[PDB]
Amino acid sequence: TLLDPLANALSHITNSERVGKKEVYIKPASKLIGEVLRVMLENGYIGEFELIDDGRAGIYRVQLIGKINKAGAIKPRFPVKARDYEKWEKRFLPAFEFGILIVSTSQGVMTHKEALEKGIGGRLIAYVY
Amino acid sequence: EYLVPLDQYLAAGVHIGTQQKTKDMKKFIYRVRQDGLYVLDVRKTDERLRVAGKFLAKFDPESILAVSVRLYGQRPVKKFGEVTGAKAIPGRFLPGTMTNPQVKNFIEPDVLIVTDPRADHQALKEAVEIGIPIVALVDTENFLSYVDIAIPTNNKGRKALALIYWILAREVLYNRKEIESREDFKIPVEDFEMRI
Amino acid sequence: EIAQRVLEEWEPKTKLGRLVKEGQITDIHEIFRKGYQIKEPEIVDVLLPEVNLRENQEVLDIALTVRMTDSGRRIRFRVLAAVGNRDGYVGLGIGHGREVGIAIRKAINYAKMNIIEIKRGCGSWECRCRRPHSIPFAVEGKEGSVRVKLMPGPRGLGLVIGDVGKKILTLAGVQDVWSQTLGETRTTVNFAKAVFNALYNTNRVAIKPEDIERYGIVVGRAM
Amino acid sequence: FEVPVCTSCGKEITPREHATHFVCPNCGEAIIWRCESCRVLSVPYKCPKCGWEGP
Amino acid sequence: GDPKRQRKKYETPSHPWIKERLDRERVLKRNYALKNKKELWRHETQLKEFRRRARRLLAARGKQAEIERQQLLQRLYRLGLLPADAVLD
RNA sequence: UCCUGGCUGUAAAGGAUGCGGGCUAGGUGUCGGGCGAGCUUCGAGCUCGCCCGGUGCCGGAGGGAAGCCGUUAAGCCCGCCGCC
RNA sequence: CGCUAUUAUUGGGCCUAAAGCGUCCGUAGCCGGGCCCGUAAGUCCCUGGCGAAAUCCCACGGCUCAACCGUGGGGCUUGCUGG
Ligand SMILES: [Zn+2]
Ligand SMILES: [Zn+2]
Ligand SMILES: [Zn+2]
């Protein structure tokens, strides 16, 4: 059944981008999804996401601009230290600063560049490029 | 308002569709009769005709193709060519006119006009291969694939094809400024039609 | 030199050839990203005179194929050939014939007609310079059963790939790369076409205006 | 030089693609580009100046 | 366990009979008056070691990293293969 | 070979295609239920359109060694078990 | 050992080539919808005590250079433990 809504959201995004759509609706919403969308907005992969309220849960409405090649969720959510990031970079990305690993830390969801600047690790949940 | 009194459109049969449909044509569709027949809106036809007139008037006359494999579209196309200086290929479109420079009549135009993208699937393909824009008259059963301007029109009626190409020629001449105004165009709509 | 030697005895058949012969198209990069069709090799002989040098004309594969009739066996020759300016322009062609010279000539003509431009850069974790000696990011290519993946490498790492890929990337202007493959790589035609498509797919990756100076991206000729 | 960008999506045009470009049939100040994918999938385009919203 | 054994300081090629490598090594042997291919191969191995050290150190964070960087650059300047105002590229 | 009461536990037992969930153009038939319009001989009746669910034929991107599959995937994702 | 993505966590495959149980219901086990409060076991950071030497990497110095030996700086010790 439904195990992970984050993966569903990200795959729906990849497919709609690959086929050339403008807007994308994500039915089972959460707070991780909002935070991931926030990171992606700050880094410049989407535009103008908003939350719509029905009585069940939230829905997310997103606009795409054509700056995504791939996007997906990392399972299992691997723990990672502040000393072993290049490994997962080489594993999930095509160049040395190209895309974003999204990490979940005890200080919030962030990109691995910010996490490394602060000097902390965490768990891996997604990647985008 | 209109380019022509609405009842003339209606008597020609511009608002008559097939017993089929297509998601790509829900815009141009307006209604469904109790018989299964679909009805097209005429406002959008008028506007797309004006736009197409401007577009084709912005081009060199003698680099323009008009193609109609259908039989009720060979005479209208021929007179459109006579009136606008544009080339017209009624019958068959020998495959290779655009891709084979070793045929007798080899040409490479700038824009293409099509009466039915389903019957004229050969010219459409060659045009796609050489990379040019496409103006097509489309009905309810037609798709919009490889089509950059679409004119909603009944494609199978002789009166409809005649009226459409008549309006198009008039608009092209106007926007080109070969004439001062409409009603300076004294060709009758009863010439463009196929004779019996 | 031989510009007036190649341009005087040529009469254009198409409209692009006429545009080139008159002098309104003057650089190689003005013929690509439009929907133009290329049906004359003299267009490329005019815009890239370097593809005519014999040292830029690798012949890759020659095969002998047989068709049965009740009389005997009819023999045909198939030649896979590569052409390229060594500064970002490559072409691949196949030619058939009843003898070997005809096949070679047709292969080189079809290779001239199938010209593409590519992007170059550094993109490696271990070099991080800004010079177009490699590809700027990893790319994928496929043909038949063959799958190829190309990854950027550091300077001095010369072309870790099979020999057909070696020659194609050398004609492309690339000097450093790592590679992975799957499938029937012993069939030269499919391997060559997969590497050609991998090189083509460098234009399919979206980038932001900040990546062009991080990786030193160059489109076509450099400097 | 500069690489053109499609008007429906935001992707760059590839060299040997079956893309096209024309002038807005409504006003006539902008240039419309269309890549092979939007042409074959009937993805609608919209003028940047006046928003004509053609097929 | 197994104890230590001294190991070679030169490498051999992966295939012995490639025309390009043969031609290049022939030219070098002739123009520098070498007796064998071992000498060429061990000089090449020196180079490869330098090149691997550089590739590793590059973008490595810490203190031992910069220490080793400066060590490498000074060693090269002393050997005579680089000027003073040089960099890791 | 059929009936009553029990054992055996196998087949091209084949869609030669394990089960659940989200996504990626549609068209045209048929079966059941519901809604809305028009006909009517006033019939649990006829025709047209829409929503849900089943079952078929075509088909574009896309996939595949190909034959072919193609929103009833042999496509991209999240899972578990059996097998080579 | 590698070649071998022919043992595949990274990283294979099961219509026709080897390969879906004849089909169902269910025990352990693995995977599990959305918000709020708590704890802080896993996870992350900082620090104390341990993980012999030789072996491995780097620079300097002594045997003609080197191999070898010495001084120092790092790793290895697949980790345990106190805050
Ligand atoms: Zn580099
Ligand atoms: Zn596009
Ligand atoms: Zn406009």
Give the number of other Cβ atoms within 10 Å of residue D23's Cβ: 16
Structure tokens at C111: 């290779």
Give the residue among C36, C43, C32, C37 at the shortest CA–CA distance from C10: C43
> Of D19, D40, D41, which is closest to B131 when you measure between CB atoms?
D19
d(CA D28, CA D50): 10
Say if residues B123 and B101 touch (Cβ distance below 8 Å). no
- What residues in C contact E58, CB-CB < 8 Å? 126-128
The C1' atom of G14 and the CA atom of B51 lie apart, in whole Å, by 58
Give the residue among B129, B118, B147 at the shortest CA–CA distance from B48: B147
> Would you give the DSSP letter of residue C134?
B
Structure tokens at A86: 């290049």
Residue C205's alpha-carbon distances to A66, B191, C103, C137, C210, in angstroms, are 11, 55, 36, 9, 14
Q: Check the annotation: does C96 bind a ligand.
A: no
Say if residues C111 and C91 touch (Cβ distance below 8 Å). yes
**Could you give the dihedral angle defined by the CA atoms of residues B66, B70, B73 and B75, in that order, rounded to the nearest 10 degrees?**
90
What is the residue whose two structure tokens read 């029937």? C184
C128 in E contact zone (CB under 8 Å): yes
Residue C127's alpha-carbon distances to B130, C157, D11, in angstroms, are 42, 11, 29
- Please give the distance, rounded to the nearest whole angstrom, from the Cα atom of residue D25 to the centre of ligand 2: 19
Q: Which residues contact A55 (CB under 8 A, 6 or more apart)?
A: none
C7 in E contact zone (CB under 8 Å): no
- What residues in C contact B129, CB-CB < 8 Å? 37
Cα-flanking dihedrals φ and ψ of residue E12, to 5°? -105, 155
User: Rg of chain A over CA atoms, in angstroms?
Assistant: 15
Nucleotides of strand F within 7 Å of the protein's CB atoms? 20-28, 37-38, 47-50, 60-61, 64-66, 75-79
Q: Check the annotation: does C43 bind a ligand.
A: no
d(CA B27, CA C47): 47
- Please give the distance, rounded to the nearest whole angstrom, from the Cα atom of residue E59 to the centre of ligand 1: 13
What is the residue whose two structure tokens read 């007036």? C4
d(CA C46, CA B68): 39
The C1' atom of G57 and the CA atom of E53 lie apart, in whole Å, by 10
Question: DSSP secondary structure string, A30-97?
Answer: -SHHHHHHHHHHHHTSEEEEEEEE-SSSEEEEEEE-S--S-EEE-SS--EE-TT-HHHHHHHH-SSTT
- Please give the distance, rounded to the nearest whole angstrom, from the Cα atom of residue C200 to the centre of ligand 2: 17
Which residues does a chain break follow in chain D (C to N more than 2.5 Å)?
none
Minimum distance, in Å, between the CA of residue D32 and any CA atom of chain C: 13
Give bridge partners of residue C142 from the DSSP assignment: C147
Give the residue among A101, A109, A31 at the shortest CA–CA distance from A70: A101
Give the number of other Cβ atoms within 10 Å of residue C205's Cβ: 19
Say if residues A50 and A58 touch (Cβ distance below 8 Å). no
Q: Check the annotation: does D24 bind a ligand.
A: yes
d(CA E24, CA B20): 73
Residue B108's alpha-carbon distances to B55, B63, C11, D18, in angstroms, are 19, 8, 17, 16
d(CA B7, CA C118): 58
C214 in E contact zone (CB under 8 Å): no
Say if residues A26 and A60 touch (Cβ distance below 8 Å). yes
D32 in A contact zone (CB under 8 Å): no
d(CA D43, CA A20): 7
Give the number of other Cβ atoms within 10 Å of residue C129's Cβ: 15
Check whether the bond before C209 is cis (ω within 30° of 0). no
Structure tokens at B70: 């259908």
Query: Which amino acid, residue A103?
Result: V
Beta strands at A58-64 and A23-26: parallel, antiparallel or unpaired = antiparallel
Q: Which residues contact E51 (CB under 8 A, 6 or more apart)?
A: C156
Residue D22 and residue B148: Cβ atoms within 8 Å? Answer: yes
Q: Check the annotation: does C133 bind a ligand.
A: yes
Per-residue flag: D40 CB under 7 A of strand F: yes
d(CA C136, CA A48): 31
Cα-flanking dihedrals φ and ψ of residue B122, to 5°? -80, -50
- In a 3-state reduction of DSSP, which class is residue C194? helix
